Amino acid sequence: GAMGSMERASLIQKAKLAEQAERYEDMAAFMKGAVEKGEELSCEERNLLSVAYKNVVGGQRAAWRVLSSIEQKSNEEGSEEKGPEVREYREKVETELQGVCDTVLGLLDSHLIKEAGDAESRVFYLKMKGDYYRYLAEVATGDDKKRIIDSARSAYQEAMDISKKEMPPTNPIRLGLALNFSVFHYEIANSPEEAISLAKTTFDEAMADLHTLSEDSYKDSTLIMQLLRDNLTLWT
Amino acid sequence: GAMGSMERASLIQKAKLAEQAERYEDMAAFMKGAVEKGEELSCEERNLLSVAYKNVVGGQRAAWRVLSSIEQKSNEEGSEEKGPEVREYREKVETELQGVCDTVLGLLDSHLIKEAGDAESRVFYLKMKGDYYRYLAEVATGDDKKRIIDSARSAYQEAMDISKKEMPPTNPIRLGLALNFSVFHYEIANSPEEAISLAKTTFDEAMADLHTLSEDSYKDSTLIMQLLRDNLTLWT
Amino acid sequence: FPATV
Amino acid sequence: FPATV
Ligand SMILES: N=C(N)c1cc(-c2cccc(NC(=O)C3(Oc4ccc(Cl)cc4)CCC(F)(F)CC3)c2)cs1
Ligand SMILES: N=C(N)c1cc(-c2cccc(NC(=O)C3(Oc4ccc(Cl)cc4)CCC(F)(F)CC3)c2)cs1
Q: Where Phosphoserine occurs, residue numbers (chains A, B)?
């Protein structure tokens, strides 16, 4: 690691600076360096890690979608052959995306998940593991696609089981996990009914627990509840 | 060059795909590969090159400005010492920006400018040369700052001299050159009166030539004229 | 696309 | 910042 010579605290400081500068590739590299120091991550540090890679892979995914759409059109009945370039470049972006996902999954496997004992850390990391297998699934087409899907499902399921036992229904990590696992069902697993059921049950159980929250906790929980509702409106 | 094995036409095709995907670093690398094939660039190709690097360096400049602002505040009377990290990271971004500028200036010097004989190509490239020295000037602080400023000024001046002899006053390249040279005067050369004079004279001479244009040419020229007016409104 | 966080 | 193109 090229961050091996930098202090852990300096890496965290520079990750925050990179965030302010919207330099998310740098932010991700700094937080990878911090993880590789071997210490567990605090709550703030876990979110710096997740924010950085979510932005990096999110940009890759958007680019992949543009290129895949162009590629499909080049393959419709009537299209003028344009050669291998669209496929090649889509493949280039795809390989870079897979590399970022493998990097994140590698950090979770070495050794963030195995040292995560508290619900807030363990659920957070297992949600990330589901998310990055889901992004691999979005581009998968080979002998491995079912196995990638099952890896996402398995990570999400373990996170769900812990979250239901150890967190209140309004916990934003629990809510975001359910939101994303619901999207997994709809978009990856061809299970729209499961997606809708999960979003609705999550929303209703959160609604019933809002009365326990402070104003600031209420704001966070209702924001993600609104995303659940948004998806349900998209799907019904 | 890692693009040495790819066809020129494939590089141009992939630059256009990268643009559609908002992958401007890739776009710039593809167009650098195309320039390094050694052939002159067509009008479309010149604009692909400029669009790519303008987006890359524009993002670097925005990040540098964020970090420089944080750094200045850390140095105000009353600030808590936070160590070398803000300076280090600003320096990192600055060095990467300088590298991109040097790359573009290198392409112009080897050998785009020397082979550019038509006004539309030669003015276009000399404007780029002024622009990328201007971006170097924005971050310069050493023994070289005056010389960087004079290099920008010299490139802009040669472009201006050609444009006034060889292009109509509504030509969008001529207009954009004047817009940017005016900004150079205001922001780099500490010559706001020159900046204002140049913008106003450029605007008025363009106004008087609009009657010669088609509807589509009119649209392009008046768009950049509006940018001249916008700056004049900012400065007066 | 649907919302995720 | 002022406009450039
Ligand atoms: N960016 C930075 N420098 C910093 C961010 C933080 C910080 C602090 C507290 C909470 C969070 N965030 C979250 O717990 C999650 O994200 C949320 C999203 C929306 C809402 Cl309304 C609430 C939470 C919950 C859902 C998710 F999917 F698991 C992802 C994490 C972050 C400290 S520093
Ligand atoms: N992006 C792509 N794939 C493609 C772009 C083109 C193309 C085609 C014609 C003109 C231009 N552009 C310009 O001549 C400039 O830019 C303009 C900006 C605004 C306006 Cl209203 C008009 C022109 C003039 C000012 C400047 F500073 F010298 C920079 C060049 C580009 C073909 S393909």
A: 10, 79
Residue of C nearest to A65 (CA): C1
Max distance between CA atoms of chain B, in angstroms, equals 62
Spatial contact of A21 and B93, defined as CB atoms under 8 Å apart: yes
The answer to whether the CB of B105 falls within 8 A of the CB of B35 is: no
- Atom number, ligand 1, closest to the C-alpha of residue A180: 27
What is the Å distance from ligand 1's center to B61 Cα? 28
Which domains does chain A carry? Answer: 8-235 (1.20.190.20)
| Alpha-carbon distance values, B116 to B31, B120, B122, B124, B129 (Å) | 17, 9, 5, 9, 13
* Cα distance between residue A27 and residue A30, in whole Å: 5
DSSP chain A: -TTTTS-HHHHHHHHHHHHHTT-HHHHHHHHHHHHTT-SPPPHHHHHHHHHHHHHHHHHHHHHHHHHHHHHHHHTSTTPPP--SHHHHHHHHHHHHHHHHHHHHHHHIIIIIHHH--SHHHHHHHHHHHHHHHHHHHHH--STTHHHHHHHHHHHHHHHHHHHHHHS-TT-HHHHHHHHHHHHIIIIISS-HHHHHHHHHHHHHHHHTTGGGS-HHHHHHHHHHHHHHHHHHHHH-
**In terms of Cα–Cα distance, which of A153, A207, A17, A147 is closest to B71?**
A17
Contacts of B235 in chain D (CB under 8 A): 2
What sign for the dihedral angle of Cα B188, B193, B196, B198?
Answer: negative
Q: Which residues contact A87 (CB under 8 A, 6 or more apart)?
A: A71
Structural method: X-ray
